[PDB]
């Protein structure tokens, strides 16, 4: 479990490349599971930036 921006959610799949996949969290090529995501702007953003 983690937060990333809505674009970078596409890197959270087996066999992807890019800095979130390659430097932050890499899924196996033989992964079994589910990737679940939702917009959290109301919780995780803040005025002045979180």
């Amino acid at each position: 479990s983690f937060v990333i921006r809505g674009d970078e959610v596409r890197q959270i799949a087996p066999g992807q490349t890019g800095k979130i996949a390659d430097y932050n969290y890499k899924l196996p090529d033989d992964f079994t599971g589910c990737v679940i995501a939702w917009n959290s702007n109301n919780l995780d953003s803040k005025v002045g930036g979180n």
Partner: protein, 50 residues
């Protein structure tokens, strides 16, 4: 014309090995017949399918 029986056994075995070696140059619908040229130009899951 007489020794053609023994020469044909030599020719058939040479033609069979030439056919087996020439089939390394075939694509079979892959991007390339060259195995390093697949791996050096595609991402892991795409190279795997080729």
């Amino acid at each position: 014309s007489a020794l053609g029986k023994l020469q044909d056994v030599v020719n058939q075995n040479a033609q069979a090995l030439n056919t087996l070696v020439k089939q390394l140059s075939s694509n079979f619908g892959a991007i390339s017949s060259v195995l390093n040229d697949i791996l050096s130009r595609l991402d892991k899951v795409e190279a795997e399918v080729q």
